[PDB]
Protein backbone atom coordinates (compact mmCIF):
# COMPACT_ATOMS: atom_id res chain seq x y z
CA UNK A 1 0.00 0.00 0.00
CA UNK A 2 1.29 3.42 -1.08
CA UNK A 3 0.46 6.87 0.32
CA UNK A 4 0.97 8.47 -3.09
CA UNK A 5 -2.35 10.29 -3.42
CA UNK A 6 -1.97 11.90 0.03
CA UNK A 7 1.06 14.00 -0.94
CA UNK A 8 0.59 17.76 -0.62
CA UNK A 9 1.18 18.13 -4.36
CA UNK A 10 -1.76 15.88 -5.20
CA UNK A 11 -3.89 17.28 -2.37
CA UNK A 12 -3.65 20.88 -3.54
CA UNK A 13 -2.87 20.49 -7.28
CA UNK A 14 -6.51 20.42 -8.38
CA UNK A 15 -8.30 23.38 -9.92
CA UNK A 16 -10.58 25.28 -7.54
CA UNK A 17 -13.01 28.15 -8.09
CA UNK A 18 -11.71 31.03 -5.98
CA UNK A 19 -14.20 33.64 -7.26
CA UNK A 20 -16.49 34.46 -10.16
CA UNK A 21 -17.83 37.84 -11.25
CA UNK A 22 -20.14 39.30 -13.88
CA UNK A 23 -20.06 42.16 -16.37
CA UNK A 24 -22.53 43.37 -18.99
CA UNK A 25 -22.40 44.68 -22.55
CA UNK A 26 -24.32 47.84 -21.60
CA UNK A 27 -23.17 51.17 -20.18
CA UNK A 28 -19.52 52.18 -19.92
CA UNK A 29 -19.18 50.74 -16.41
CA UNK A 30 -19.52 47.27 -17.94
CA UNK A 31 -16.14 46.16 -16.56
CA UNK A 32 -15.54 43.96 -13.52
CA UNK A 33 -12.75 44.01 -10.94
CA UNK A 34 -11.52 41.73 -8.15
CA UNK A 35 -8.82 42.16 -5.51
CA UNK A 36 -7.08 38.79 -5.49
CA UNK A 37 -7.55 36.84 -2.27
CA UNK A 38 -7.94 33.13 -1.54
CA UNK A 39 -10.25 33.55 1.47
CA UNK A 40 -13.54 34.37 -0.28
CA UNK A 41 -14.02 30.69 -1.19
CA UNK A 42 -14.51 28.11 1.55
CA UNK A 43 -13.17 24.83 0.14
CA UNK A 44 -9.77 25.97 -1.13
CA UNK A 45 -9.37 28.32 1.82
CA UNK A 46 -9.75 25.45 4.28
CA UNK A 47 -7.48 23.15 2.26
CA UNK A 48 -4.68 25.74 2.26
CA UNK A 49 -5.32 26.87 5.85
CA UNK A 50 -4.52 23.33 6.95
CA UNK A 51 -0.99 24.83 6.94
CA UNK A 52 0.48 28.06 8.29
CA UNK A 53 2.97 28.71 5.46
CA UNK A 54 2.90 27.63 1.82
CA UNK A 55 5.04 28.24 -1.26
CA UNK A 56 4.00 27.31 -4.78
CA UNK A 57 3.35 28.39 -8.35
CA UNK A 58 -0.17 28.87 -9.71
CA UNK A 59 -2.12 27.63 -12.73
CA UNK A 60 -4.88 30.11 -13.60
CA UNK A 61 -7.78 28.76 -15.64
CA UNK A 62 -10.68 31.01 -16.63
CA UNK A 63 -14.19 29.76 -17.45
CA UNK A 64 -16.10 32.60 -19.14
CA UNK A 65 -19.75 31.95 -20.00
CA UNK A 66 -22.11 34.53 -21.47
CA UNK A 67 -25.86 34.92 -21.78
CA UNK A 68 -28.13 36.95 -24.04
CA UNK A 69 -29.97 39.29 -21.66
CA UNK A 70 -33.47 40.54 -22.52
CA UNK A 71 -33.90 43.17 -25.21
CA UNK A 72 -36.80 44.81 -27.01
CA UNK A 73 -35.32 44.98 -30.52
CA UNK A 74 -36.09 42.68 -33.45
CA UNK A 75 -33.65 39.89 -34.40
CA UNK A 76 -30.58 40.17 -32.14
CA UNK A 77 -27.91 38.42 -34.22
CA UNK A 78 -24.96 38.73 -31.84
CA UNK A 79 -21.51 37.93 -33.28
CA UNK A 80 -18.89 35.98 -31.36
CA UNK A 81 -17.80 37.88 -28.25
CA UNK A 82 -14.19 38.35 -27.14
CA UNK A 83 -13.07 39.26 -23.62
CA UNK A 84 -10.01 40.89 -22.07
CA UNK A 85 -8.65 40.00 -18.63
CA UNK A 86 -6.15 42.58 -17.35
CA UNK A 87 -3.93 42.19 -14.28
CA UNK A 88 -3.06 45.45 -12.51
CA UNK A 89 -0.34 44.75 -9.93
CA UNK A 90 -0.52 46.95 -6.82
CA UNK A 91 0.21 50.54 -7.80
CA UNK A 92 -0.64 50.34 -11.50
CA UNK A 93 -3.25 52.40 -13.30
CA UNK A 94 -6.84 51.36 -12.62
CA UNK A 95 -9.49 51.04 -15.36
CA UNK A 96 -12.21 53.59 -14.62
CA UNK A 97 -14.36 52.73 -17.67
CA UNK A 98 -14.71 50.03 -20.29
CA UNK A 99 -12.91 52.37 -22.73
CA UNK A 100 -9.99 53.44 -20.53
CA UNK A 101 -6.40 53.84 -21.68
CA UNK A 102 -5.38 51.36 -18.97
CA UNK A 103 -6.78 48.65 -21.26
CA UNK A 104 -3.81 49.31 -23.55
CA UNK A 105 -1.84 47.00 -21.20
CA UNK A 106 1.53 48.00 -22.62
CA UNK A 107 3.10 46.36 -19.55
CA UNK A 108 0.27 44.89 -17.47
CA UNK A 109 -0.21 41.25 -18.55
CA UNK A 110 -3.62 40.48 -20.00
CA UNK A 111 -5.39 37.72 -21.92
CA UNK A 112 -7.61 38.16 -24.98
CA UNK A 113 -9.96 35.19 -25.44
CA UNK A 114 -12.85 34.64 -27.85
CA UNK A 115 -15.88 32.62 -26.77
CA UNK A 116 -16.25 29.01 -27.86
CA UNK A 117 -12.62 27.87 -27.48
CA UNK A 118 -10.70 26.04 -24.79
CA UNK A 119 -10.68 27.98 -21.49
CA UNK A 120 -7.67 30.30 -21.31
CA UNK A 121 -4.89 29.20 -18.97
CA UNK A 122 -1.77 30.94 -17.70
CA UNK A 123 0.77 30.03 -15.02
CA UNK A 124 2.31 32.47 -12.55
CA UNK A 125 5.45 32.01 -10.40
CA UNK A 126 5.88 32.44 -6.63
CA UNK A 127 5.18 36.17 -6.53
CA UNK A 128 5.57 36.76 -2.81
CA UNK A 129 7.91 39.21 -1.13
CA UNK A 130 8.60 36.84 1.77
CA UNK A 131 10.21 33.43 1.58
CA UNK A 132 6.76 31.81 1.73
CA UNK A 133 3.09 32.63 1.39
CA UNK A 134 1.49 33.26 4.79
CA UNK A 135 -1.91 31.79 5.68
CA UNK A 136 -2.17 33.42 9.12
CA UNK A 137 -0.81 36.56 10.76
CA UNK A 138 -0.97 37.15 14.52
CA UNK A 139 -0.06 40.80 14.20
CA UNK A 140 -1.02 44.25 13.01
CA UNK A 141 -0.23 46.44 10.01
CA UNK A 142 0.76 49.54 12.00
CA UNK A 143 3.76 49.56 14.33
CA UNK A 144 1.47 51.12 16.95
CA UNK A 145 -0.26 47.72 17.35
CA UNK A 146 -3.32 49.31 15.74
CA UNK A 147 -4.99 49.77 12.38
CA UNK A 148 -5.56 46.34 10.84
CA UNK A 149 -5.26 42.96 12.56
CA UNK A 150 -4.87 39.81 10.51
CA UNK A 151 -3.98 38.36 7.14
CA UNK A 152 -5.44 41.39 5.32
CA UNK A 153 -2.30 43.30 6.35
CA UNK A 154 -0.27 40.96 4.12
CA UNK A 155 -2.66 40.22 1.26
CA UNK A 156 -1.47 42.64 -1.44
CA UNK A 157 -1.48 40.80 -4.78
CA UNK A 158 -3.09 43.40 -7.05
CA UNK A 159 -6.40 43.66 -8.85
CA UNK A 160 -7.89 41.76 -11.80
CA UNK A 161 -10.16 43.51 -14.31
CA UNK A 162 -12.50 42.08 -16.94
CA UNK A 163 -14.21 43.56 -20.00
CA UNK A 164 -15.93 42.82 -23.29
CA UNK A 165 -13.81 43.77 -26.30
CA UNK A 166 -16.74 43.89 -28.73
CA UNK A 167 -18.40 47.22 -29.46
CA UNK A 168 -21.78 46.06 -28.07
CA UNK A 169 -24.93 45.53 -30.13
CA UNK A 170 -28.71 45.77 -30.24
CA UNK A 171 -29.07 43.17 -27.49
CA UNK A 172 -27.50 43.14 -24.05
CA UNK A 173 -25.10 40.37 -23.07
CA UNK A 174 -24.16 39.47 -19.50
CA UNK A 175 -21.05 37.35 -18.97
CA UNK A 176 -19.68 35.50 -15.95
CA UNK A 177 -15.96 34.80 -15.51
CA UNK A 178 -14.90 32.08 -13.07
CA UNK A 179 -11.28 32.14 -11.83
CA UNK A 180 -9.67 28.79 -11.02
CA UNK A 181 -6.48 28.38 -8.99
CA UNK A 182 -4.32 25.24 -9.17
CA UNK A 183 -1.24 25.23 -6.90
CA UNK A 184 1.75 23.66 -8.66
CA UNK A 185 5.12 22.71 -7.14
CA UNK A 186 3.85 22.93 -3.60
CA UNK A 187 5.78 23.34 -0.36
CA UNK A 188 3.89 23.65 2.94
CA UNK A 189 5.04 24.18 6.53
CA UNK A 190 3.66 24.10 10.06
CA UNK A 191 0.39 22.15 9.89
CA UNK A 192 -2.50 23.36 12.02
CA UNK A 193 -5.93 22.06 13.04
CA UNK A 194 -8.52 22.03 10.26
CA UNK A 195 -11.19 24.72 10.20
CA UNK A 196 -14.14 23.67 12.36
CA UNK A 197 -16.46 26.68 12.59
CA UNK A 198 -17.75 28.02 9.29
CA UNK A 199 -15.99 30.99 7.76
CA UNK A 200 -17.52 34.43 8.30
CA UNK A 201 -15.23 37.03 6.70
CA UNK A 202 -12.51 37.01 4.04
CA UNK A 203 -10.17 39.37 5.91
CA UNK A 204 -10.01 37.71 9.35
CA UNK A 205 -10.40 34.47 11.29
CA UNK A 206 -13.58 35.62 13.06
CA UNK A 207 -15.79 32.64 13.84
CA UNK A 208 -19.04 31.83 15.60
CA UNK A 209 -18.45 29.15 18.27
CA UNK A 210 -19.45 25.60 17.35
CA UNK A 211 -19.35 22.25 19.13
CA UNK A 212 -16.46 19.83 18.84
CA UNK A 213 -18.29 17.02 17.03
CA UNK A 214 -21.62 15.47 16.15
CA UNK A 215 -23.43 14.01 19.15
CA UNK A 216 -24.67 10.61 20.29
CA UNK A 217 -26.72 9.70 23.35
CA UNK A 218 -24.30 7.95 25.69
CA UNK A 219 -20.62 7.03 25.67
CA UNK A 220 -21.69 3.45 24.88
CA UNK A 221 -24.09 4.33 22.03
CA UNK A 222 -23.28 2.29 18.91
Amino acid sequence: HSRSESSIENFLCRAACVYYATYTNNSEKGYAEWVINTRQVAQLRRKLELFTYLRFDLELTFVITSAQQPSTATSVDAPVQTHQIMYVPPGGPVPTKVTDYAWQTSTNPSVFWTEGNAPPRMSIPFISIGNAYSCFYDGWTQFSRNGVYGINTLNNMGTLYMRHVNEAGQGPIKSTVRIYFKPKHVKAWVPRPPRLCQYEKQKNVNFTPTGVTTTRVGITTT
Binding site: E9, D57, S123, P125, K184, H185, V186
Partner: peptide, 18 residues
Protein backbone atom coordinates in the same frame (compact mmCIF):
# COMPACT_ATOMS: atom_id res chain seq x y z
CA UNK B 1 7.39 12.36 -21.86
CA UNK B 2 9.01 15.10 -19.79
CA UNK B 3 10.11 17.63 -22.42
CA UNK B 4 9.50 21.23 -21.33
CA UNK B 5 8.43 23.74 -23.99
CA UNK B 6 8.59 26.91 -21.85
CA UNK B 7 11.63 28.87 -20.68
CA UNK B 8 10.25 29.49 -17.17
CA UNK B 9 10.17 26.84 -14.46
CA UNK B 10 6.71 27.95 -13.29
CA UNK B 11 5.39 26.73 -16.66
CA UNK B 12 6.30 23.12 -15.86
CA UNK B 13 3.88 20.38 -14.88
CA UNK B 14 3.24 19.32 -11.30
CA UNK B 15 5.84 17.39 -9.30
CA UNK B 16 3.98 14.09 -9.45
CA UNK B 17 6.51 11.72 -11.06
CA UNK B 18 7.24 9.47 -8.06
Amino acid sequence: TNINYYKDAASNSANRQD
